[PDB]
Write a protein that binds this ligand. Sequence first.
Ligand SMILES: C[C@@H]1O[C@@H](O[C@H]2[C@@H](O)[C@H](O)[C@H](O[C@@H]3[C@@H](O)[C@H](O)O[C@H](CO)[C@H]3O)O[C@H]2C)[C@@H](O)[C@H](O[C@H]2O[C@H](CO)[C@H](O)[C@H](O[C@@H]3O[C@H](C(=O)O)[C@@H](O[C@H]4O[C@@H]5CO[C@@](C)(C(=O)O)O[C@@H]5[C@H](O)[C@H]4O)[C@H](O)[C@H]3O)[C@H]2O)[C@@H]1O
Ligand SMILES: C[C@@H]1O[C@@H](O[C@H]2[C@@H](O)[C@H](O)[C@H](O[C@@H]3[C@@H](O)[C@H](O)O[C@H](CO)[C@H]3O)O[C@H]2C)[C@@H](O)[C@H](O[C@H]2O[C@H](CO)[C@H](O)[C@H](O[C@@H]3O[C@H](C(=O)O)[C@@H](O[C@H]4O[C@@H]5CO[C@@](C)(C(=O)O)O[C@@H]5[C@H](O)[C@H]4O)[C@H](O)[C@H]3O)[C@H]2O)[C@@H]1O
Ligand SMILES: C[C@@H]1O[C@@H](O[C@H]2[C@@H](O)[C@H](O)[C@H](O[C@@H]3[C@@H](O)[C@H](O)O[C@H](CO)[C@H]3O)O[C@H]2C)[C@@H](O)[C@H](O[C@H]2O[C@H](CO)[C@H](O)[C@H](O[C@@H]3O[C@H](C(=O)O)[C@@H](O[C@H]4O[C@@H]5CO[C@@](C)(C(=O)O)O[C@@H]5[C@H](O)[C@H]4O)[C@H](O)[C@H]3O)[C@H]2O)[C@@H]1O
Ligand SMILES: [Mg+2]
Ligand SMILES: [Mg+2]
Ligand SMILES: [Mg+2]
Lengths: 602, 602, 602
Amino acid sequence: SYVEKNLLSSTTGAAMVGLPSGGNLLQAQYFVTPEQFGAIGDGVTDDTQAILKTITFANTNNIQVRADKNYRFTSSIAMSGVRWYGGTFTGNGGTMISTVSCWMENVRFEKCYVKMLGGDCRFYRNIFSNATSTAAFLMQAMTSEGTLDFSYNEMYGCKYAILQQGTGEVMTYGRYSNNYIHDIKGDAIELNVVQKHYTEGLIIENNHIANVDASGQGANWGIGIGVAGSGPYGVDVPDSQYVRNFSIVGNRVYNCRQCLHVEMGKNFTIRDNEVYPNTAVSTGTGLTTCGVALYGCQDFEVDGLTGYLLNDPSVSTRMVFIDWGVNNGRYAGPPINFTIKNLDIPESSIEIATSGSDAWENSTIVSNINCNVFKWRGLPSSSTFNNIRCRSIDFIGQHGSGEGSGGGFYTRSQFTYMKWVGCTALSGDETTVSFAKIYTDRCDQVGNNFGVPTAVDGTGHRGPVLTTISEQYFTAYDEFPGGREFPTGTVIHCASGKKHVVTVGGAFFSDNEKIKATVTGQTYLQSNALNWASNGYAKAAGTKIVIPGAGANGGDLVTTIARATYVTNSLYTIDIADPIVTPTAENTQIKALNPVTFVTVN
Amino acid sequence: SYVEKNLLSSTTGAAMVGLPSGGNLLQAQYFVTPEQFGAIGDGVTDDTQAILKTITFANTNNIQVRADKNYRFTSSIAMSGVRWYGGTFTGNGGTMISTVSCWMENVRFEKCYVKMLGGDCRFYRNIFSNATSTAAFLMQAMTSEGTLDFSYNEMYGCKYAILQQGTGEVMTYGRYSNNYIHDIKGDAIELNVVQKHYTEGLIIENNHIANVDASGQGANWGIGIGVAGSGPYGVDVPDSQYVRNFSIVGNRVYNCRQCLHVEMGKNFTIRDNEVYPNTAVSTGTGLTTCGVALYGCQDFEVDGLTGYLLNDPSVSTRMVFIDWGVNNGRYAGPPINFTIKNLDIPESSIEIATSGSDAWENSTIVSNINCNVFKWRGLPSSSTFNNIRCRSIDFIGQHGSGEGSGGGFYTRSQFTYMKWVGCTALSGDETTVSFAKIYTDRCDQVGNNFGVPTAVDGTGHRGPVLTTISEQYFTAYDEFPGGREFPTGTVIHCASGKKHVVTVGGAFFSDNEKIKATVTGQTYLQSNALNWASNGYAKAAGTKIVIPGAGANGGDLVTTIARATYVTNSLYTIDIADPIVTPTAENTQIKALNPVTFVTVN
Amino acid sequence: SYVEKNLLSSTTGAAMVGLPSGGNLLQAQYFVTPEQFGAIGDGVTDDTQAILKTITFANTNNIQVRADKNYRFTSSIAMSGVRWYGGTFTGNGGTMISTVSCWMENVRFEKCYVKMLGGDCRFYRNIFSNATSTAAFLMQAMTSEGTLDFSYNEMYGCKYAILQQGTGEVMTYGRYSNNYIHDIKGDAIELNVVQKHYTEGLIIENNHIANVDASGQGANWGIGIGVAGSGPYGVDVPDSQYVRNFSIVGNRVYNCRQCLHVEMGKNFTIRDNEVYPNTAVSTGTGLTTCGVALYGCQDFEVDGLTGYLLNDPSVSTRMVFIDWGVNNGRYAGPPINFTIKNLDIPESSIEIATSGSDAWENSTIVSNINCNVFKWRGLPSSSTFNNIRCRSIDFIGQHGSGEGSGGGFYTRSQFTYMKWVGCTALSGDETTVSFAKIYTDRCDQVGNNFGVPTAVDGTGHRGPVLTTISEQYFTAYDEFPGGREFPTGTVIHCASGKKHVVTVGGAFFSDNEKIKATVTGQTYLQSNALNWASNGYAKAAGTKIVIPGAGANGGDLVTTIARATYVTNSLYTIDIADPIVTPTAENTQIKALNPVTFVTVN
Ligand SMILES: C[C@@H]1O[C@@H](O[C@H]2[C@@H](O)[C@H](O)[C@H](O[C@@H]3[C@@H](O)[C@H](O)O[C@H](CO)[C@H]3O)O[C@H]2C)[C@@H](O)[C@H](O[C@H]2O[C@H](CO)[C@H](O)[C@H](O[C@@H]3O[C@H](C(=O)O)[C@@H](O[C@H]4O[C@@H]5CO[C@@](C)(C(=O)O)O[C@@H]5[C@H](O)[C@H]4O)[C@H](O)[C@H]3O)[C@H]2O)[C@@H]1O
Ligand SMILES: C[C@@H]1O[C@@H](O[C@H]2[C@@H](O)[C@H](O)[C@H](O[C@@H]3[C@@H](O)[C@H](O)O[C@H](CO)[C@H]3O)O[C@H]2C)[C@@H](O)[C@H](O[C@H]2O[C@H](CO)[C@H](O)[C@H](O[C@@H]3O[C@H](C(=O)O)[C@@H](O[C@H]4O[C@@H]5CO[C@@](C)(C(=O)O)O[C@@H]5[C@H](O)[C@H]4O)[C@H](O)[C@H]3O)[C@H]2O)[C@@H]1O
Ligand SMILES: C[C@@H]1O[C@@H](O[C@H]2[C@@H](O)[C@H](O)[C@H](O[C@@H]3[C@@H](O)[C@H](O)O[C@H](CO)[C@H]3O)O[C@H]2C)[C@@H](O)[C@H](O[C@H]2O[C@H](CO)[C@H](O)[C@H](O[C@@H]3O[C@H](C(=O)O)[C@@H](O[C@H]4O[C@@H]5CO[C@@](C)(C(=O)O)O[C@@H]5[C@H](O)[C@H]4O)[C@H](O)[C@H]3O)[C@H]2O)[C@@H]1O
Ligand SMILES: [Mg+2]
Ligand SMILES: [Mg+2]
Ligand SMILES: [Mg+2]
């Protein structure tokens, strides 16, 4: 009347054991484990065949796998339809596990990698550690269309972490969110030639990436997050060559040679990312150091960016780099129809190369920027520049050969529009801007601390020649205000009713100016003739001046007034931004860099 | 000395089996399974009663349920306090499972739906598939106050996915985050008449929604994400009728007739959503196609929007639609106190209808916009418009009957303020704006490529009559600059000291202008008399001109200069934006659309 | 031939039971449970020793723990390397569980707290309820370097929820995301003196916090989210004293005395948070009520803020408070190099106290703001103010002793720059601004509804004395436009060619103005002499006026025209913003607050 030794060991033996529910143990087997198929789980014993039987059994009976041990395996394993919770797989270094419609949580993939081959796959709260394959999580040549949620995983110690190659069946939708990827030697997330994919959306969001160092590795290795469509680049190539409708939002990329990269992307947004590039990592892989690098892209925004470069600024300050593509050594595919905005990168610089044509429109917006150098090439059909705080401007509109990517390639004889509102180029006391070849038919400009010159490409080609009057002042006195630069066209209205019109932009310094002798290294000047605390002979900080003979080897010294008139040692004094190089003798003149001409009415 | 066959099958039988811990199997029963209560799990056998006993046992003993099979059930199941992990429920199509204070993970609800009835409920990493009930996840007539975290679930194949009806006990807090909802025939997330709910917050964030097609379904079906308070609409109805303090952030809604909808919302934010409306889906359900539709709302912002419409633009370009509500065929409840900003939707259009009164203030801000048509009705007590790039402006301030929602209903005789700074209305070569009925006491305007006319509603009612001078220019020459439009009040300062004041805004074209004969379809004009490459007879691109007799049936052709003066075939030439319709003979005049009048001082 | 009673109970007994896989029950033991070590799980029996053996066994054999019951424990438990799923721990109130490299999910920590001591720890989907210890989740004196993911947990009923004390080994990286913290009596998230920590990043994002009420508790208790570096404060103290490179993004903090707090932070961002402060909670703990409070911080942005205060506005409207630090009763450490932008807080106020020096630069940006009072102290080396909508401005540049934090401490004689573009100070009909001590060398200002006066700190010290002309108007008539305020320097161009230049800013009211008698409480005035519907004697709403003798005790009444000229009862009428206090007799004069002086040319 007792249970037999046999039968209890049979495939129905658990049916003999009662449980508090009133059912039996056989009814409690909601899973299988690899140990039930012979796995040792010691991380050393070869468990490959045990794993294969588990997968076969789970597929055939549609039963989830539970595991907690460490399964050493030595050759490829194919999985289809499996739900797997827990455990560690330990490959040879780069051994492959393929998944079709697989759901995996709390798994550690040690010294191996997962290759997704199709279906609806889901990966949560896993660890991918120490892979020596090209990628730790690979999407390539899928045999059926896929969707993917790849979220809250941690990946480290590998080469590429997440890599997609766009051959095969399409991924229609993918979310890559809240992963933690660190201490790797390839890209953290690279989606290569995926223009056909992600029709219903690609979203790469809230990933935290740290220490991407591809030193000594292959070409292009070491990008933080990268998305690539298909060449050839070109302003008019078909929409189907581009990766479209995707977003890269809220990620953090620390200590990486090139944090964010897109080429041949269209209709996309790069929003609120935080990046810390470093010239010193991924040595030899050929990447241009920066936070955001975009090539040949159209119809996109960069909206919100923070961080700074970790290397010394003398090596690089490049943070935003928006450029043409290249086909076989020839530039092609200017970026067009884009918005750069809300960047908070005061230490770091922006470089943009675009274009404009009669054959297609290009409308650009740059807005709400805090940066270091703002460097720009190209003349869109319309370009607006609003609330840019920068430390210098390096700007050429219709740039020619030798003046930047695609110089000379396109021109636009039709209506060309530009606007500059509320911008500030200022570093300490210096306002440092350079503008050229702005062949605009209309240019509105207000609220800037500088004037923007526009140019004419052949007589009559941009309408009547006009100068926008951006500054007008009132003085309670009649004498022209000295020592302060005014652009051409500036009007001064006097309380008496007189008015001055500036016909050659510049500043007034009397021909009777005399300064005290100077010595090398001196950063102030003192008056030996005129009253610099009068309005007519005043000295305004920010004004560019020339001190004859005071520069290197007796050249003229061009400098900036750093502090306006004050009295010390009973003399009128100003400070200059650059020290005297060659000493000057008593009663040397000082002059404006740009001497004003004005006319007076009444 | 051997175990009996009986007793081992008893409810304590597992106590006889030793484990490596040194305990017994009975101590390892941390869960129950449905199979322990007779469930077959084959998806075909009716397991309803087995499921009910499981729920009873789990509730009574506070023990979690584990499952992995497929439980066909055929009538309603009520659950309270249950923690359930895994398995598939398969109903008849719309069979109900109710939950009170339930926690569910990794469950598939197939052909059935969950109805939440109260407590603190949590749903993670579930699938809701193929429901034929009205909603797949329903909140209605809760019998106790609730909180809800509904996150990282996938829902598809249903009618409504998530639906709340606000009757019963309140949901005090709810987070709906990171769900994937697709291929449905009702709304993806609809919270209807929930003004009493969400005192401690409603947050709808980072959901990815795709393919919402309610064609052939009931009224209003097919909204992407919708939130509704209670009628009647009205500017002064009680705060308690509104859904308040909620947020809709970071969602993606692809291929949906009306992606985001709020009515009777107050103190809310719609931030950084990406939407792709489509006129072709939800045929017959009566929705206005767009990305964001807001009715009767107050104290809100739309901050950040991307995407575009999937249908052909000839059918619709409507993306943002902010409008009054309607009570029984009468408009009521103008939107007031709102901010529209940071929209990146260059292909798509914005339509806003508001109002202003002496009885209440309405302060509006529209800022940092990239859009197609900007259409506006209504005159707030203060309205600011900053850094708007658009392709046309269609604007009426105090709009009357027949000119938009609520036209004529309210007026404001007190101080009314408006500002336009740094805006651009431009499509290729055309600046296309229409303004009327701007009855402002002060209007500041700078940095725009157009002038904003203000109007007076009865003599003296807006102070002395002033025209803001928005443009002033300098010329090195005395002749008036030809061929370029200047608003009324424009001042031209000459290097000689002369000045021109524009007393009737417009452009100068000499009465002696003669052009060569033209033929139908021609898009250029050539001079037969004057030197168009002189400043006085210049031709600026963007200027609107009239070619007598060249329009349809010999009407005048109003067009725009597309390219300023150039020489070809030894003649001064300009391009026009619109082709000649009716041919013109040699020595026809060309004129400004708006002929200038100016006076010259000196 | 039957199984023995013994042996089946042995540590290998499960090996005798067959399963459908063909393996045995021993191979299915992927976990241990506390009941296998003697735990009763009734929440009452002391299970402390049972828990300790479980931890020992799990550590020694590297096996996960599963649990579902309620384990009462009574003294500290140390855990290292454990993977624990499920169950409830119930301490004495504040009993400690320590973790080193622990992974915990679906656990409830009742009346106890977790103290993290190092390694890589992970906490998901847990509940921390009713702790009476100082904190429910404590990081302090870690014995090895840590990383932490603390996400999707719920915490309530405690004192501090999450607290870190920065002594011991560093946390190199931490993500605190998507938690739900409510009904607590300390801070929700407080990271105190952690300047050495988070080299690879600190990210606090998408947490929902509600009801933080530290009434009756210790000093500083009741902050929503707080991050603190190390004193002493000071503009030039070493970088190592600051918490750096962190972010506080997307959180919601409802009903809290001080929602967000940072002191001694550098290179950080506070982005898109929603906050609802309340003066009534945390009574006695000494916190300044507001949404965001920053002390002594540098190189940071506040980007995006919504919400409002829950108390009556008469008690407080303070929402943003950016201030110096304090060392031993002396202010020190001005905030420098910061950007305040994208704030949508129309009901609530902003208070900023900064500084500027020759010894270091300070570049500030305030942009795209909707607020109530905008209060500012301090004169940076460069400061820009763009698209600020506010209800009043309270501004002093180089503020002195008694005029705000750090008044008098620093001055900058070198180039000092300021810009105001497109700002609006307006409350109903009143434009209420106060500016002083703006000692700038250049100040660009356009598109505002007010003028910004700049000042000179000693003759000659800011260059020639200039007034920016911010407004110019055109009139079709010659008479000066009456009843409307114009800043000094305003130019009016007449259609006749005449021009008026405003030499003393103000408004024109004729000396022949006479009004009808008034009575107390009256809010309109009526003309008894002049035609107020003429341009020369016009009355513009918004103009500040003086009614002699009409204020309290026969003082002059200074008020604002609320409605421009209209006719009622056959008399020219205006409305005023403030009622008559002391009655005035027939034929009293009305005057401008600021009487204009102008000169006319021609
Ligand atoms: C050096 C290089 O590194 C990676 O590529 C980088 C980068 O260097 C490259 O320049 C490119 O950079 C992008 C750039 O073009 C674009 O302009 O900008 C992007 C930024 O947005 C840049 O990222 O792409 C990067 C990813 C490697 O991907 C790359 O590999 C490729 O070249 C080598 C030749 O040197 C090989 O030819 C690779 O070929 C693949 O190799 C696998 C493999 O595992 O062997 C094949 O797979 C299969 O066959 C094996 C055989 O064994 C069995 C039978 C088994 O045991 O199971 O099956 C195995 C496996 O499961 C099978 O799938 C692939 O089919 C094959 O395509 C080629 O990918 C290079 O190393
Ligand atoms: C056509 C319509 O579709 C949905 O409503 C849509 C939309 O059409 C409608 O216009 C509205 O649109 C909103 C609009 O008003 C506002 O202005 O803008 C919003 C955008 O922000 C728009 O969304 O709301 C939308 C949701 C349906 O919700 C709607 O249903 C309603 O009308 C029909 C009549 O045609 C019914 O009267 C519905 O009544 C509910 O029906 C259920 C039910 O299951 O039968 C009731 O429940 C219970 O009783 C059954 C009986 O069986 C047992 C005993 C059992 O076996 O267990 O219990 C069952 C169940 O568990 C019980 O709860 C509800 O109580 C009852 O209210 C009504 O909802 C319509 O179909
Ligand atoms: C009142 C106060 O509340 C908290 O501190 C608040 C706040 O009041 C304080 O002003 C400060 O505020 C910050 C402010 O300075 C800065 O400027 O701005 C920040 C905003 O960004 C403000 O937050 O910090 C806040 C957190 C408490 O933290 C604080 O505690 C501290 O003071 C008291 C004295 O009144 C104690 O001295 C605390 O000392 C700690 O106490 C524990 C303990 O549990 O006893 C010690 O731990 C250990 O020893 C016990 C003994 O038992 C065993 C043997 C066992 O049974 O296992 O081990 C136990 C435990 O496991 C051991 O760790 C700590 O080592 C010790 O440091 C002191 O923290 C005060 O209550
Ligand atoms: Mg777009
Ligand atoms: Mg608000
Ligand atoms: Mg920074």
